[PDB]
Design a binder for this molecule. Sequence first.
Ligand SMILES: [Mg+2]
Ligand SMILES: [Mg+2]
Ligand SMILES: [Mg+2]
Ligand SMILES: [Mg+2]
Ligand SMILES: [Mg+2]
Ligand SMILES: [Mg+2]
Ligand SMILES: [Zn+2]
Lengths: 124, 109, 126
Amino acid sequence: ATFKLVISDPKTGIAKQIEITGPEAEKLIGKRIGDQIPVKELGINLNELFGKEFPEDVKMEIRGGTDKDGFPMRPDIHGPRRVRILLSKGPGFRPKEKGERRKKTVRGNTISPEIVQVNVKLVY
Amino acid sequence: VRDIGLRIQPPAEKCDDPKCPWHGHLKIHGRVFEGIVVSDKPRKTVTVERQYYHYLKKYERYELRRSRIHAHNPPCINAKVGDRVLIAETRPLSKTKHFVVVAVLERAE
Amino acid sequence: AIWQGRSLRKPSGGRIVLARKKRKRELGREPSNTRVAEQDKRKIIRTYGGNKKVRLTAAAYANVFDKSGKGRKVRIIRVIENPANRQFARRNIITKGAIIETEIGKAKVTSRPGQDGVVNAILLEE
RNA sequence: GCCACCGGCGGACGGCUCAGUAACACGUCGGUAACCUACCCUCGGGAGGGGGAUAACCCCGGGAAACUGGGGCUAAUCCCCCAUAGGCCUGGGGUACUGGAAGGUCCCCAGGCCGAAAGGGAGCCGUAAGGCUCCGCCCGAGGAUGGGCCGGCGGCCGAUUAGGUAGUUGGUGGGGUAACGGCCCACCAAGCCGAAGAUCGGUACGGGCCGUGAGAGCGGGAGCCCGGAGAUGGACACUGAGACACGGGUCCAGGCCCUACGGGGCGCAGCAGGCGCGAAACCUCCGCAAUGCGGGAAACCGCGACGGGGGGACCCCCAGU
Ligand SMILES: [Mg+2]
Ligand SMILES: [Mg+2]
Ligand SMILES: [Mg+2]
Ligand SMILES: [Mg+2]
Ligand SMILES: [Mg+2]
Ligand SMILES: [Mg+2]
Ligand SMILES: [Zn+2]
């Protein structure tokens, strides 16, 4: 579809975002969390927005991402499906009590044409 | 001769089991009653009966009352039907046995 | 959902209608059937009041004993004639009367494994 | 000096109503040698070494809302490991203590399993070492406060309701529990209540007490105190010393509400206020000054508990025209 990538530089702790679509939104449509995709092949985006210093063999991997309505991606439920499970911690729940639980709606692991935001970081 | 806190005389034999106050590992503590046996059909258990008088207050007369309980019957003093027994109180032994026989008086008649 | 409260039937045979609900302080847990294996596993529980209970689940050694108070930690082979249950000696479930067959003879268990988390025995005579 | 966030303690008490319950639910006398217990009191002992994330804060957001994602940096009375003290089980052998009576306590051998802590914080004195005293942390023995469990006895109506029970009654060996117990299980038996009313129906929260009568008695147990039970009906678990939790969490059934139609929520038998039902029942008020509770080293802070008024031929006492 179209996505909103959140590129984050772990070596200096600043981030940027860009909007990709068309040919770009087909080469990461089926990728799972922690995949290490090369930047040059996918990325029409350039060595900018950060200061123009990166090498040429850099690549990023998938970390998380929300959904079309606003639900997070729980990196344990494999499959691009949407479920409603009872949580106690972890991505998808903010407890704010002791020993408490709740029934929150989360999304699977594989990217889909429903995901709108994708979170990535740059390993060199 | 061993006593258990009743100032009475022990039985003339020796037992086996541990649910006997005289020879085993049971402790007695509580009420101390006295009645006559009305059945010993099942194993190691009897049924003891005692009678008392209730005093009504409006009519000012009396009235005869009963009480049937169930007691463990150790193998050294095995009591039959129709004889006086002294029984004591202790912890729950089964669903409905909470007393134990300790001494037998007037066996036959 | 193993409720260990009262009964619902009087000693005379009439039924009882419960007047309250089940209190959390009356419940029970699952039988921890001890097996024979090549490595013993055990867990730890938190109990009423904050205490603990060590819970053996598989057995490897035996702690066999004697008449002069001389123990020896030796491993077990299999169970024979558990009088508790009719089909335990076959599946190798050790409860408390089990007749353990150590590698130095026979023995009789004298401890509760599911409560203490150890197996103890006396050297049964022939 | 102000503010939120990590961290500790409290929210299981207090307030409300009487639906269910003929029962060890309640009253009274006893039992636990068959049990748990944070805050608090006394005595006797310990605080020796290592390691680690992540809220606040900074850079990007997603979603209509409820809410929630990715990267960076940081600390503890936060979290985790090692050692030692200690806790638990079983075998063998001594006789030191309590008690009416030791499956308990104490001492000596042996085989195993579990396994602690924050020398942390604030004032002062001396150049500094370093003290002085205030609030603290962990283990053991005992109490106290609060309960769980178990007996003996005592209190309604019905025969146009006579037989009832099959884990039902008991024994042997076990599991489970904080703990005894057919409380559950595997085998062996045939017991157990009953015309002195069992079983099944009916109605009902129990007592201290209250109305009436010269008394014997007959009738009632809304309001105050003490016990029990419930949070729209039925099932079930997490955290904790304690709950299967009225203002905490799931599932079903039955109602209602917001929505950008994809998804979210709520349940006054707390205090005022509203609708419905009925012959039948009040202000959407002011305060933490008093009695007390939770927190804090303390001064203090919060409390529809409690305290002050507003409405009404509620019951008593003392007067006017
Ligand atoms: Mg409450
Ligand atoms: Mg009835
Ligand atoms: Mg973060
Ligand atoms: Mg038994
Ligand atoms: Mg009723
Ligand atoms: Mg009126
Ligand atoms: Zn005897």
